[PDB]
Design a protein around this motif. Structure first.
Motif, mmCIF file in Angstrom:
data_model
loop_
_atom_site.group_PDB
_atom_site.id
_atom_site.type_symbol
_atom_site.label_atom_id
_atom_site.label_comp_id
_atom_site.label_asym_id
_atom_site.label_seq_id
_atom_site.Cartn_x
_atom_site.Cartn_y
_atom_site.Cartn_z
ATOM 1 N N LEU A 82 0.842 -1.161 0.000
ATOM 2 C CA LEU A 82 0.000 0.000 0.000
ATOM 3 C C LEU A 82 0.884 1.220 0.000
ATOM 4 C CD1 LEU A 82 -2.670 -1.561 1.647
ATOM 5 C CD2 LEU A 82 -2.847 0.866 2.143
ATOM 6 N N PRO A 83 0.391 2.303 -0.617
ATOM 7 C CA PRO A 83 1.153 3.551 -0.663
ATOM 8 C C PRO A 83 0.806 4.452 0.518
ATOM 9 C CG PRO A 83 -0.663 3.682 -2.203
ATOM 10 C CD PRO A 83 -0.696 2.286 -1.617
ATOM 11 N N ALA A 84 1.789 5.241 0.924
ATOM 12 C CA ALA A 84 1.627 6.215 1.997
ATOM 13 C C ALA A 84 2.097 7.542 1.331
ATOM 14 C CB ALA A 84 2.532 5.850 3.168
ATOM 15 N N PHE A 85 1.343 8.638 1.455
ATOM 16 C CA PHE A 85 1.770 9.909 0.825
ATOM 17 C C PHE A 85 0.937 11.148 1.152
ATOM 18 C CE2 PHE A 85 -0.952 8.696 -2.994
ATOM 19 C CZ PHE A 85 -1.513 9.917 -3.374
ATOM 20 N N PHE A 86 1.599 12.310 1.058
ATOM 21 C CA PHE A 86 0.958 13.599 1.322
ATOM 22 C C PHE A 86 0.491 14.062 -0.064
ATOM 23 C CE2 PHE A 86 2.152 14.137 5.788
ATOM 24 C CZ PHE A 86 3.352 13.373 5.920
ATOM 25 N N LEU A 120 7.662 15.116 9.014
ATOM 26 C CA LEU A 120 6.344 14.545 8.884
ATOM 27 C C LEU A 120 6.450 13.308 8.024
ATOM 28 C CD1 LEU A 120 3.541 17.049 8.744
ATOM 29 C CD2 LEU A 120 5.362 16.734 10.357
ATOM 30 N N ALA A 121 5.675 12.313 8.394
ATOM 31 C CA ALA A 121 5.600 11.078 7.630
ATOM 32 C C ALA A 121 4.318 10.382 8.047
ATOM 33 C CB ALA A 121 6.815 10.196 7.792
ATOM 34 N N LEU A 122 3.862 9.546 7.141
ATOM 35 C CA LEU A 122 2.615 8.859 7.314
ATOM 36 C C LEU A 122 2.878 7.379 7.219
ATOM 37 C CD1 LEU A 122 0.652 11.472 6.049
ATOM 38 C CD2 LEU A 122 -0.624 9.375 5.674
ATOM 39 N N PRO A 123 2.071 6.591 7.943
ATOM 40 C CA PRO A 123 2.221 5.136 7.914
ATOM 41 C C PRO A 123 1.340 4.513 6.834
ATOM 42 C CG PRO A 123 0.789 5.742 9.722
ATOM 43 C CD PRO A 123 1.268 7.037 9.100
ATOM 44 N N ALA A 124 1.812 3.394 6.308
ATOM 45 C CA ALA A 124 1.083 2.623 5.309
ATOM 46 C C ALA A 124 1.036 1.200 5.940
ATOM 47 C CB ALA A 124 1.862 2.605 3.999
ATOM 48 N N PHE A 125 -0.125 0.538 5.975
ATOM 49 C CA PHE A 125 -0.192 -0.815 6.574
ATOM 50 C C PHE A 125 -1.515 -1.563 6.425
ATOM 51 C CE2 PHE A 125 -1.497 1.313 10.726
ATOM 52 C CZ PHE A 125 -2.460 0.438 11.233
ATOM 53 N N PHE A 126 -1.411 -2.900 6.456
ATOM 54 C CA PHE A 126 -2.576 -3.778 6.342
ATOM 55 C C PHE A 126 -2.973 -4.045 7.799
ATOM 56 C CE2 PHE A 126 -2.441 -4.618 1.765
ATOM 57 C CZ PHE A 126 -1.067 -4.439 1.421
#
Lengths: 71, 71
Positions: free
Chosen positions: A47-51, B45-51
């Protein structure tokens, strides 16, 4: 072994497709060739993570207002 | 220079806090010490991606049904 002429040293290789493969123009045509013999069942899930870009932010608003009206 | 006894070779270091720092028990107390002098304004800043785990999947359902009722 799909019958190609791979004349390259690497990293970029330069491939010449056999005469019968009209469907093979771009480099990308070549990628689905590798991911077909290999199997579409060997591409893992991720899965992608992004702003998102600023201007895309909010485009749902006109829509929801119309959906909220049906409600 | 926060006045600690850092007696380690590395990678795990073993630090002894000065006598006045009661707030420094765990290793984690130590991390906010590094991210405070450094600045909370240097954590990007960063975002998580996960199942998500299977069992967590759907827990919103009871809720939405109640919210849909107020609507």
């Amino acid at each position: 072994r799909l019958g190609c002429r791979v004349e390259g040293e690497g990293p970029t290789y330069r491939v010449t497709p056999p005469s019968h493969r009209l469907d093979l123009r771009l480099e990308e045509d070549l990628v689905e060739e590798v991911a077909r013999i290999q199997g579409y069942e060997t591409i893992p899930l991720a899965l992608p993570a992004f702003f998102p870009a600023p201007d895309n932010r909010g485009v749902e608003a006109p829509y929801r207002k119309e959906q909220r009206l049906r409600e």
